[PDB]
């Protein structure tokens, strides 16, 4: 331990190195340093995690210095390694390392190799900052750093307009979220003036004698931000388009990084949300609605990447339900399993959309089963864990523990919903899977094996199974409240889950695997078509936003392309130019005039003098 710093210094060093080495490096060397650093950061995460368990699970705080000082305003650069932190961190450097290898192979011979890897190193560094957040400010360095790197990697393939504009939808939205988070910070500092988790948690019950009015806002904004970075509603619109990025990215940011950051922040501030019941209740709610809408839509995506996307959105939805109903250990456990099998799913999706020569559309694909074994198998394992297959999948244990919290707290509506959602997930997941690997092989794929591809896929497959469920996050020593346990209903429940899951997979098999004549017939129907386009279109949100925000914003911008104020001010100048000419019209060399002028002027002087 005590090397908590290396878990940032490494990714950071890598980053600077790769960013100062533009193309001057052979794919193999920049791959070497890019993957390598993060690798050594994983290694250090292991060393420190081990010294942590051995040391007896003692909260470790390593203060680096003070980021800044004002009178009552003291913010510090401190790293706080506890159990939750160790989960976040382990996940990051691990899943990270893996995605780093798979990307290592995936990006061979491509615009800016060194560049991609630099950005990645910065993404890791940023995340690791985020997770070792002593306060909220250093954390905010985290969230911003993250959002940024995500903007860069999404909008990595700059040459195309659509790509970029996806990166910008990303940054804008994640930003607005980050503003809500801000407000959270400003309120929590005006009220407690410490912005350091533990202290806020104490001075919180102390100072909020008559709380439940300013604490409410603080937390609810913490939520705002959480929603933002986790793509929950209603800051979800940015997730779909996000798929415009290179696959390895859609793994990193989509499975083991950003969304997880949102949920994790909502976790660390558990004590604060607790003191504000209603908003924790909200957290739950939005989690639910999100997993639902997300599912329904994920059902219609004609694109591998985008299906997987609305998947990640629904899953994060689950996690937000787990949190919304005081099932913190459940939420985080699930976050881990989900990093596992979502990393798996996305890497695989890369190997496939690539092996199809950049096809990426399910329909223009097909019968891949025989063509590629490794990949097909991976989509089966993953897709199954995601579907929450009763055994051999950790995802089942996840969903379970979660609904165990849900029901276990008399929140049976979020429970029922969540189930409806398990049905949903199994269903769409396999619509995709079947449609991609079973049926008429339209594009003749072929396979290629290397360590830097196979190995990662293999480890992710392993950990994506029930074997993944073997690992358990040290969420007791941290103090996050234990979930209210259940029993006897634990089995009725569990089998209900397994049953809905299996019914799902089967029904998907019957729905597509044949002629699809039923599904096809029901697509062309009027209602089925209406809804079809609906769920296809993110439910209409992108529309509502582009219509009430983007359109009128740009509307103003066009409406003022020239400063109406600059002109409003040029008014006097004009008055004085034309006044100029006007008067000037009295010098006309006519002596007679000038004389008559003296005369009149005299007359005015006399009249005035008389009147006064």
């Amino acid at each position: 331990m005590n090397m908590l710093a290396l878990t940032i210094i490494l990714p950071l060093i890598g980053f600077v190195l790769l960013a100062f080495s533009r193309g001057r490096w052979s794919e193999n060397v920049s791959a070497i340093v890019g993957v390598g650093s993060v690798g050594l950061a994983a290694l250090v995460t292991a060393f420190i995690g081990v010294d942590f368990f051995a040391n007896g699970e003692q909260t470790y705080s390593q203060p680096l210095w003070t980021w800044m000082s004002v009178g009552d305003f003291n913010i510090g650069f401190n790293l706080v390694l506890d159990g939750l932190s160790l989960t976040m961190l382990s996940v990051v450097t691990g899943v990270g390392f893996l995605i780093h290898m798979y990307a290592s192979w995936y990006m061979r011979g491509e615009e800016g190799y060194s560049r991609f890897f630099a950005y990645t190193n910065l993404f890791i560094a940023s995340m690791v900052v985020l997770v070792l957040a002593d306060n909220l400010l250093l954390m905010y360095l985290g969230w911003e750093g993250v959002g940024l790197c995500s903007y860069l990697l999404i909008g990595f393939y700059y040459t195309d307009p659509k790509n970029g504009a996806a990166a910008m939808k990303a940054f804008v939205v994640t930003r607005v979220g980050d503003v809500f988070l801000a407000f959270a910070l400003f309120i929590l500092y005006n009220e407690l003036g410490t912005l350091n988790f533990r202290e806020m948690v104490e001075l919180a019950p102390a100072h909020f004698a008559d709380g439940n009015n300013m604490l409410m806002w603080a937390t609810l904004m913490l939520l705002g931000g959480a929603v933002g970075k986790s793509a929950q509603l209603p800051l979800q619109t940015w997730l779909a388009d996000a798929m415009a990025g290179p696959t390895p990215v859609s793994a990193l940011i989509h499975a083991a990084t950003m969304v997880t950051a949102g949920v994790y922040l909502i976790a660390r501030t558990h004590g604060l949300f607790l003191m504000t019941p209603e908003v924790l209740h909200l957290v739950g709610i939005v989690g639910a609605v999100t997993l639902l809408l997300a599912g329904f839509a994920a059902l219609v995506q004609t694109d591998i990447k985008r299906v997987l996307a609305y998947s990640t959105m629904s899953q994060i939805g689950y996690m937000f339900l787990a949190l919304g109903v005081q099932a913190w250990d459940a939420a985080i456990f699930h976050l881990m399993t989900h990093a596992f099998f979502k990393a798996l799913l996305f890497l695989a999706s890369g190997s496939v959309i690539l092996a199809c020569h950049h096809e990426q559309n399910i329909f223009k694909m097909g019968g891949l089963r025989k063509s590629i074994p490794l990949v097909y198998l991976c989509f089966l394992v993953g897709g199954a864990a995601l579907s929450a297959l009763p055994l051999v999948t950790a995802g089942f244990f996840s969903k379970d523990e979660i609904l165990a919290g849900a029901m276990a707290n008399g929140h049976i509506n979020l429970m029922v919903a969540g189930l409806v959602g398990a049905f949903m997930t199994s269903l769409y997941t396999f619509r995709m899977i079947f449609i991609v690997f079973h049926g008429k092989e339209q594009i003749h794929a072929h396979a290629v094996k290397g360590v830097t591809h196979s190995l990662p896929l293999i480890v992710l497959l392993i950990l994506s199974t029930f074997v993944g469920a073997l690992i358990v996050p040290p969420l007791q020593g941290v103090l996050p409240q234990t979930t209210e346990l259940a029993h006897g209903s634990m089995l009725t429940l569990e089998i209900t889950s397994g049953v809905v899951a299996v019914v799902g997979i089967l029904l998907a098999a019957w729905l597509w695997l044949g002629k699809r004549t039923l599904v096809t017939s029901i697509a062309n129907s009027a209602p089925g078509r209406l809804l079809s386009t609906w769920w296809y279109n993110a439910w209409g949100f992108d529309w509502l936003y582009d219509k009430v925000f983007v359109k009128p914003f740009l509307g103003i911008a066009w409406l003022l392309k020239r400063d109406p104020l600059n002109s409003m001010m040029n008014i006097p100048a004009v008055l004085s130019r034309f006044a100029g000419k006007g008067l000037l019209l009295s010098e006309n060399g006519y002596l007679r005039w000038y004389v008559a002028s003296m005369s009149i002027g005299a007359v005015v002087v006399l009249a005035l003098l008389m009147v006064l």
């Binding site: 000037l584 010098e587 006309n588 060399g589 006519y590 002596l591 007679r592 004389v595 005369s599």
Partner: protein
């Protein structure tokens, strides 16, 4: 007898007439004439005031006023002559070259 108001009223009336003329007239000769009528009216007033008050000042001033008169007729007619070799009539509006 000698109501100062009437003498001064005379002075004024004349001054005004002379000015009017000065504006009405296009021929520089006539304008110069105007100017003379004016300087004369003003000196007249001055002496009338010098009569209200038992002072030699009204008069000595009048003296200066007419000294001026002379100098101005000198230079003014000299100008007119310099302008007869440039305009048959001394129509004054013709000198309008310089303008705003």
């Amino acid at each position: 007898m000698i109501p100062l108001q009437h003498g001064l009223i005379l002075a004024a009336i004349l001054f005004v007439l002379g000015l009017t003329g000065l504006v009405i007239r296009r021929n520089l000769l006539f304008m110069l004439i105007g100017l003379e009528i004016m300087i004369n009216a003003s000196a007249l007033a001055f002496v009338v005031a010098g009569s209200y008050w038992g002072q030699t000042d009204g008069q000595v001033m009048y003296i200066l006023a007419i000294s001026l008169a002379a100098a101005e007729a000198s230079i003014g007619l000299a100008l007119l002559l310099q302008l007869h070799r440039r305009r048959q009539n001394l129509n004054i509006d013709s000198v309008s070259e310089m303008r705003g």
